[PDB]
Design a protein around this ligand. Structure first.
Ligand code: CYC
Ligand code: CYC
Ligand code: CYC
Ligand code: CYC
Ligand code: CYC
Ligand code: CYC
Ligand code: CYC
Ligand code: CYC
Ligand code: CYC
Lengths: 146, 162, 160, 58, 160, 162, 162, 160, 162, 160, 160
């Protein structure tokens, strides 16, 4: 969900305890992680909503957006209701329950169909984070000569 | 995103400096404008639907071919998409006015927006006209002091889009 | 800052800022002169604060500046005082911003990893930050002392 | 209101699945209120039956 | 309320309240007496507010009380005034709460579907809220007037 | 969750009534304690790790066989879960103290905790003793009035366990 | 990823051939070096934190401009991300050394890394300096026979970055 | 191979290889010479294995080479025998690899669709690879025969 | 899940005791049975389809009503589900036989299987007879020595259902 | 153990164990007597290992048993030695298991939070583990000390 | 049925049926009488269809009833003809329902695994179903013959 290992101080201990007690499933744990402030800070705040949709599909379906209809639906959701409702839309989808069900961690996929989705998913799952992790203290190119 | 305070902090932090009198003057300016900014944001939020109403009415009166058959805003779906984009522009303009910084615009709106409209086919000049129309509608409601402040960020969106 | 927190919270919900958030921003901007006065006072006393805090740290822990300590030598002790200066600057940034977010994401995230890689003992940092708290809160007035103390407590707890 | 404790059994009617999916067939989970209508409707449309509904909190 | 928002925000990240959140709660509790006075003075004059707000509403957009309108007749106008009394009570609740959460939970969520099922025109509801805002701000002090106007503006925006 | 203000609002909303004199009296009583609650919460937040360390040391010194082999807290995993639970209780007592209501405890900690601990084998008596140790340490740190306020929620947690 | 064995299998599979005397020679060559590779991987995994410590110290000593205010290694967050990247490079170099092949490097580290760093603002010359420093630090611990092999994968990372 | 499996498992968990994984790699490379001679022995005798396995396959299953059988005629029988040769080559690859990964990913994934498109009976595959097992474990010593038979059993199970 | 070795480790861990003669004897017993277990697991894995065919044929010849209309195995979907369940039991019994414990049988098979069959309408007694058929077929296959080792876990599954 | 890891890996893919996994388990069970003798040697001389390792630990870091140190006193030094004994027992468990899972599950998951709540310096633990590694590998032959070193190095890295 | 699929599709978007689905149900129920006539004509033609299809199957594929064949023997030929009877009943069900949903649900989901467990050659399935199609089409008029052939073609495609 966060594209790399997360340090222990940024981990969410409450969903971890609820998952270890068996109270919530892996689908609910993924939803907890998505709805966290960490996900909003790393994957909603630094991007436009159209990029946010692509990141949503990447992280929770292991996929690139299939078609323009998906973009239209999720853009309407993001404009109206916000990030939480888009997250619940991705996680309550039939595709999610058919690929990962209730107990499987989502993983990278390269679907054969529809057309263009395999190449887009390759470019998506290959893409690493490109944005600075903080808005404070930017770095600059420049040498100091000794 | 950055605000005015974050901008001052970043400027003095990339060079490892404590705040100087120039920094305190900038911060005083932001704190002095804060009351006006909050009043403007409250007024805009109270009248967001109205602003989008007569902004879109003005845009489609100046460019009638947008909503007539053959126009980019001609269908219920595309008209609703047009007003949705205008809601985007107004809401993020209000965010940028309240922050005192244009980072949120470059960072949530203008980032790849021209590419998005070229892929979709959206006329960008007409979108700029819609943003301007939103500007004249908003300036009436907020008041002149807030009108200039909102005009800064409306101009920023119009320039970045065009 | 406070305003950025309100705006990102509103943006996550695709809405305009509610009257509570606007009241929070109003209260924040009404107190800006006090925050700038506190930050300016902490900026003037920067060298005094660092000097006394370093002296208090070293007189409790002679081994750090003795042969075989982490901060042994003039250059390493200077790096010590420079880190204390970093954190005082961050506290002033937090005071002007109205939150510990500058402190957090300039010098708290990954601080344990950094000091572990540097073999700098974290208890030394916690004690040094407590010394800086005492020296700095001594200089300010009581109402400002409590505010500065909150930021120093946050820093000390985050390092611990 | 607040959480539900829902027990439902979802059989498989479109295919015979090779993994185990015992946990995907019978499951008890906590569903909080603003998602329960949608979750109940999805369980119903999947052909599953809802065995019990309880109000844990609220 | 403000306290509930701050606690929920801190809880979601599994952390104690930050100095900024505690500052927000302090500013909220400090303004308790002005909020109580505002809510009490709106409560004591609620009959006058409702009466002249309804008068102003029906003067502005008469088609409500014209034949064929949603508020035709004494009973439907009574239901209109009762709805206004509801929303004035929720405005007082929000004033004491420091946010719009009571208004949201009692009279905003589902108001769209509700008034569709009642055939009530939402622009009429917005005009009614505007009239009641003008009336209520008419009989309060300037700062109190602004405080009440923010919540009424939120309600009008939510109805629109 | 609900705080004192939200509790009063809920009561008068279900009654369908405007605020009365008694409601305003309750609101005055809650507002009058705001600064005390804020100071106590800040003190607890600044000293939470110390409170947990001292309370866990007291609990394990009184009951050494909890963390020796065969005890419920015998492993680094079990010890970690124990101290994490103690942090949970302290943080949620602080939240409930700020809200002036014990609800958040009910719907976010105590719901199912007795059943969970009985199914896991967690000793309820020893958990209660750990909570009381946190109560003593916190009351020593926060002062008399703040300790009187915090003890309500510490006792509420201990009683909801049993 | 593919190792030496699977590389030989590939070369003979694309030709539709059973294994020849040269194939058996290459497989013997890989099997002969297996215990050396296992010992070197165990040594590196034992001293990974130490190796990263010396490598980071050397890199930040030669280039103090990375950790000065306004450098790409200036914050606790960015210092941590730098040493994290060095951990990445060390671990994947150990993987490739165990495999006897550089395919895992290309697929999992170098793919898109240059543009990722360019977008992040991460200096690539300084990253190559850190990788080289890590190479000299590791070579001393692993030993000459292991150092010659491990430097192959470190230089592969350096050339891919360049 | 064994090394690839261990490295991939260690990579999916973002960790260095465990002592047990290094131990399995040590055991794998220590036994490389014996499995390497096993592959050598099977490679020298390709023609005899394929000829004898085809003979037993066609004697056990005359319908495959009878008119209307999938392998009826000289050229289809040759295609049959060269599929068997493919699988013997994959078995040698798996023997040197130390796991059935080369067999799994060259001649198992999608084998059902491939042979369904070709009207090739999967049972016929099963007794064909069983006959090739018998011939191939005839030439090897007992331990080598068992080790090779494990791979042939895996292939037969995959085709089944 | 748990193995025999892990079981001994946990028993001596909850006591906080080092291994003694009894623990070493149990570990030696498992190590001695290890090669027999691996041979049985390989033989079963090779012949899983054949074992399932023979066992399902025996079950549906003893109870033909299961596959005629009205039987719980009458449809292609329901027959496939039945033979699929037989595959489950065989594979997990093989896992348990390799492990030397039945912990995997409890955790990953029998956890809520009885009520799942009850709600679905699967005849538990018929399923137990199918498991018995698999036991007979597998015992005829692996050999006399491994037959009892396999039948232990087959009987564990049967008793878990019944 | 090794068997558990192989079974879980096979179960994740819903397949029987491949010849590679079976060969791994065969190599594990074939080596059982050797690791059992190693574990018996370690446990029969555990008191000597603990006493000596504590001696090197206290020589390298006398500040631990010095005034103001965490191990100062008879009872605290006894707790230190008892922790060393715990980890020696875990190392023997790992030896018999064939991997570091017993160590990881009893002494590593949550060890940082444990020793933080106890005010125990982690580098002290790392060097104590190194001392136990040296002393314990002293008792064994080169071949046995070879595999025991990997378990001790894993423990040291996990604490570090 | 047609009604079932239309209702499920409408419930998918949580909406009432559109004019398309309503007209679809109208056209379906308008043709019910000729569907019942066709299902009859298939129903009373039991033995002719089944025995002629089985005879033509065994004529084209003598291997099935030849020694060593799947259908060799009286009881196994009875099972073969019984499977054909099953599928003819399923075809009549699909005819009356207006879709392949009865055929699919009763005999298509999992049929491949079923016949794999029964070592039944699926090409034998397809040839038998084509024989049944020819015989059943021979007994009907052209308009009905095309529709019935569509269902038999669906069954053959599901088996192949
Ligand atoms: C904030 C809401 C919340 C609470 C209250 C909470 C408690 C909680 N403690 C748990 C386990 C545990 N709890 C304890 C603590 C006990 N050990 C004994 O020595 C002590 C008497 C006592 C503590 C003072 C221990 C040792 C475990 C581990 C049991 C196991 O893993 O088998 C679990 C099961 C899942 C897990 O291990 O994380 C829960 C849910 N979790 C939550 O999300
Ligand atoms: C396993 C393959 C892999 C690689 C290689 C990888 C590199 C990588 N480094 C990153 C950030 C970073 N990387 C560095 C490291 C640099 N800064 C210093 O100046 C040094 C010259 C240099 C390290 C020696 C820094 C400082 C950042 C933080 C950038 C930021 O937050 O703005 C990021 C962005 C997201 C993140 O991790 O925070 C990636 C993807 N990620 C991967 O999954
Ligand atoms: C092809 C799909 C499509 C539709 C349906 C559509 C409707 C539409 N009607 C409009 C104006 C209007 N539409 C109406 C119609 C309303 N007046 C009464 O209330 C009636 C209840 C109701 C009509 C039965 C009126 C009065 C206006 C003028 C509003 C104005 O200019 O202020 C406009 C604004 C642009 C313009 O005036 O040219 C649109 C886009 N546009 C589309 O692309
Ligand atoms: C906050 C940053 C942001 C923006 C602004 C944004 C805009 C945006 N506008 C879109 C479509 C659209 N946008 C418009 C509006 C334009 N066309 C009309 O002519 C007008 C002149 C003009 C508006 C004033 C229209 C008509 C469409 C429909 C295009 C189509 O699908 O054919 C889409 C495609 C998804 C969808 O149709 O819902 C996006 C993502 N997305 C973002 O993440
Ligand atoms: C703005 C965020 C930020 C911080 C805080 C920061 C600290 C920092 N301190 C460093 C060195 C150091 N830091 C210290 C300080 C420690 N010595 C004692 O143990 C004390 C407990 C303690 C001081 C109170 C010392 C002695 C060194 C020199 C270590 C050496 O050269 O070997 C370094 C390594 C590079 C250098 O020499 O400048 C960093 C990056 N860097 C940052 O980008
Ligand atoms: C790995 C542990 C595990 C087990 C054991 C397991 C059994 C299992 N069998 C099921 C259905 C079934 N199981 C059977 C088998 C019965 N029919 C005959 O009468 C026989 C007596 C008997 C088998 C020998 C049948 C016919 C169904 C279909 C029930 C239906 O859909 O109506 C289902 C419901 C999901 C589905 O239909 O695919 C489960 C979960 N699942 C698991 O994950
Ligand atoms: C506390 C939150 C809450 C609200 C707000 C609420 C509104 C509400 N208004 C109602 C009726 C009504 N409400 C109105 C008001 C409308 N008349 C004009 O059109 C105006 C635009 C507008 C008011 C300014 C009217 C006319 C009716 C009568 C509808 C009828 O009987 O047909 C009713 C139906 C019950 C009845 O018969 O009295 C409800 C439930 N209920 C709630 O629980
Ligand atoms: C098997 C997994 C496991 C471990 C490892 C474990 C360790 C452990 N050590 C403890 C005390 C202690 N442990 C130490 C050891 C430290 N002193 C020096 O600094 C050294 C660096 C270091 C030892 C090498 C000391 C000094 C204490 C006493 C601390 C006190 O009195 O508060 C305690 C507190 C209760 C007690 O006294 O037993 C635990 C739980 N518990 C477990 O269930
Ligand atoms: C309503 C859906 C449904 C179907 C279709 C179905 C088929 C079916 N046929 C079976 C037997 C059989 N079926 C056949 C038929 C084959 N023999 C030749 O190869 C032909 C190509 C082919 C027939 C056209 C044979 C020979 C058997 C006996 C297998 C044996 O005894 O080993 C069996 C096993 C139990 C039994 O003996 O009855 C099933 C379940 N079951 C169902 O619930």
């Amino acid at each position: 969900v966060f594209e790399r290992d997360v340090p222990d101080y940024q981990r969410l201990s409450y969903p971890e305890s609820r998952l270890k007690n068996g109270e919530i499933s892996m689908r609910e744990f993924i939803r907890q992680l998505a709805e966290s402030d960490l996900y909003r800070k790393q994957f909603y705040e630094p991007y436009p909503n159209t990029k946010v949709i692509e990141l949503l599909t990447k992280h929770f379906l292991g996929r690139a957006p299939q078609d323009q209809a998906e973009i239209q639906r999720y853009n309407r959701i993001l404009a109206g209701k916000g990030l939480k409702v888009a997250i619940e839309e991705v996680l309550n989808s039939d595709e999610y329950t058919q690929l990962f069900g209730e107990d499987v961690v989502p993983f990278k996929r390269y679907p054969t169909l529809p057309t263009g989705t395999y190449l887009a998913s390759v470019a998506t799952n290959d893409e690493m984070i490109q944005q600075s992790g903080s808005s404070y203290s930017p770095s600059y190119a420049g040498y100091s000569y000794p | 995103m950055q605000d005015a305070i974050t901008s001052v902090i970043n400027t003095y932090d990339v060079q490892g400096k404590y705040f100087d009198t120039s920094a305190f003057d900038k911060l005083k300016a932001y704190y002095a404008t804060g009351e006006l900014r909050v009043r403007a944001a409250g007024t805009i939020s109270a009248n967001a639907a109205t602003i989008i109403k007569e902004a879109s009415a003005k845009l489609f009166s100046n460019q009638p071919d947008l909503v007539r058959p053959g126009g980019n805003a001609y269908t219920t779906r595309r008209y609703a998409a047009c007003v949705r984009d205008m809601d985007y522009f107004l809401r993020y303009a209000t965010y940028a006015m309240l922050a005192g910084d244009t980072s949120i615009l470059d960072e949530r709106v203008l980032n790849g927006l021209k590419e998005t409209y070229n892929s979709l086919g959206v006329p960008i000049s007409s979108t700029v006209q819609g943003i301007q129309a939103m500007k004249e509608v908003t300036g009436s409601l907020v008041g002149s002091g807030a009108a200039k402040e909102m005009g800064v960020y409306f101009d920023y969106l119009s320039s970045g889009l065009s | 800052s406070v305003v950025t927190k309100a705006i990102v919270s509103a943006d996550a919900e695709a809405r305009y800022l509610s009257p509570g958030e606007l009241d929070r921003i109003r209260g924040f901007v009404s107190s800006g002169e006090r925050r700038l006065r506190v930050a300016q006072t902490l900026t003037e006393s920067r060298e005094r604060i660092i000097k006394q805090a370093g002296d208090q740290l070293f007189q409790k822990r002679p081994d750090l500046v003795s042969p075989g300590g982490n901060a042994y030598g003039a250059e390493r002790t200077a790096s010590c005082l420079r880190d204390l200066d970093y954190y005082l600057r961050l506290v002033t940034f937090g005071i002007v911003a109205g939150d510990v977010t500058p402190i957090e994401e300039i010098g708290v995230i990954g601080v344990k990893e950094m000091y572990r890689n540097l073999e700098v003992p974290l208890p030394g940092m916690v004690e040094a930050v407590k010394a800086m708290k005492s020296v700095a809160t001594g200089l300010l007035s009581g109402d400002d002392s409590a505010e500065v103390g909150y930021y120093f407590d946050y820093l000390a707890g985050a390092l611990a | 209101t607040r959480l539900f404790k829902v027990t439902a059994l979802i059989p498989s009617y479109k295919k015979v699945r090779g993994g185990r999916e015992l946990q995907n067939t019978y499951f008890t989970k906590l569903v909080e209120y603003d998602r329960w209508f949608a979750e109940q409707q999805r369980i119903q449309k999947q052909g599953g039956k809802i065995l019990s509904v309880k109000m844990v909190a609220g």
